[PDB]
Design a binder for this molecule. Sequence first.
Ligand SMILES: N#Cc1cn([C@@H]2O[C@H](COP(=O)(O)O)[C@@H](O)[C@H]2O)c(=O)[nH]c1=O
Ligand SMILES: N#Cc1cn([C@@H]2O[C@H](COP(=O)(O)O)[C@@H](O)[C@H]2O)c(=O)[nH]c1=O
Lengths: 258, 258
Amino acid sequence: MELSFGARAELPRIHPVASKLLRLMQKKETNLCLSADVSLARELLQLADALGPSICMLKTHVDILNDFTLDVMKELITLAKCHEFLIFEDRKFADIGNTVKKQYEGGIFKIASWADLVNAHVVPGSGVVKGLQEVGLPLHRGCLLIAEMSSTGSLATGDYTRAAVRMAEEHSEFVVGFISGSRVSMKPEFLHLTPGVQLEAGGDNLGQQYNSPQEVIGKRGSDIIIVGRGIISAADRLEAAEMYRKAAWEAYLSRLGV
Amino acid sequence: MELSFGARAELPRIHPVASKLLRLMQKKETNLCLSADVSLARELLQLADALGPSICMLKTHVDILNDFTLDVMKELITLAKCHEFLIFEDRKFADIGNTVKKQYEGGIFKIASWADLVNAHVVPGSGVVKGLQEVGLPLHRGCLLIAEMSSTGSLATGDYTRAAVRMAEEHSEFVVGFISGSRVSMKPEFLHLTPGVQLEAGGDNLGQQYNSPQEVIGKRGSDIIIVGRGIISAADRLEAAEMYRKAAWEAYLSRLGV
Ligand SMILES: N#Cc1cn([C@@H]2O[C@H](COP(=O)(O)O)[C@@H](O)[C@H]2O)c(=O)[nH]c1=O
Ligand SMILES: N#Cc1cn([C@@H]2O[C@H](COP(=O)(O)O)[C@@H](O)[C@H]2O)c(=O)[nH]c1=O
């Protein structure tokens, strides 16, 4: 009952955003999401171009860009289209519906205009999702709910995690999956994306914890690895990206039996 | 014993930002924080200028400004100094320390350079505080932990709330208080700020819930009311601000005993 990415893309209950993603993952043999945590647009675009072929998704923090403009986003979309990857803004919407609606649609970033995917914390209750949903957009858009976090002392456990899953299942018209450390939903239509990934054991000095692709994808049953520093801080970024891609891909293959 | 704002300003263990706030609260007889959720810089500045005399604090969502620049913040600083209020950016930092550090110091908004106060969700664990503190501590900035939320279905309850209080108490060099619905700490050095306030019973259509100043300050023991739509939507914003100020102030006085 474990299905390939390509098969999952065709599930009756699949969201169009999820389908698109799943299809390209299968085509490109990648379940790697690059976390492009950089300070300059030039670097963001360089990464997108060089590593585009190796990734299913590019995760942005547009607020960390010193020189964000929508023109930058236009260029990013072009690369996304070229290389075939989704854009995920790691916005972490985390307030009342009325506020997040505005934060998604409007303001300086105009996130909804370019981000295939965003994420939200579940702490405010389901209003956080409802608010995001109320943004009118004749484009295919999805949301990921933060069900678990990668950091030491995370409170996104137990009943909290269950709450996230329930909220997702109840808003499946928009919510396409999770940020989690493992498989949290038994429903194959939902994507699992996992940050806190490096080839080596460890962490950082500010509460990040790392697990390997084999652990996260293979043992813990997640779908996609999110990797920042493991790539962007590497001596050879393309080489690193390819290692991560191959690691995650093989780990995934291991679940498909035969 | 319940202390006045002015007395609290003098507590041995008081944070400088907290002391500054408390002093101006006492001076101006205001425990009202204006929430200015506006789409134009001009409107932000206009409201800050007009309402400044009535408020202890102005809460911003800079990301909702269609036309944010650092020059806007330059101008806000001027108004804040003139009228005597603190600037609180409602950023809701909510990730690993390494990331939030960047989101606080850098990028497009350079929040730490102008915000007296910011807030953080506690869901990622204490790394969120550690990351922010590295930037903010030596700049005499302060942080508020989101211990409770105003929205329907909020998960910031019970053990979650208790975790926020512990985290605050353990980072008292930087954490100066809470976003909460009520008094959550018995330590008078900590500030309690409460959104979800209007004179009238009700809510919005996206999960916001309202309670009155008398209820939240008087009965529930919070310190400061955060009011958005209740003021901004009024025909006469000045009158509205004054009504809210008078309500919150009297509710506070009521706790001060014989
Ligand atoms: N939600 C969420 C999370 C997001 N992230 C984000 O994923 C990225 C991890 O980057 P890195 O540690 O450099 O591989 C970084 O942008 C961070 O903000 C987590 O690390 N953990 C989470 O739980
Ligand atoms: N943390 C936090 C919260 C922030 N806020 C913010 O406070 C403001 C309330 O605005 P209003 O409902 O218009 O009075 C708004 O900017 C919203 O994003 C809450 O309403 N509830 C919270 O729990």
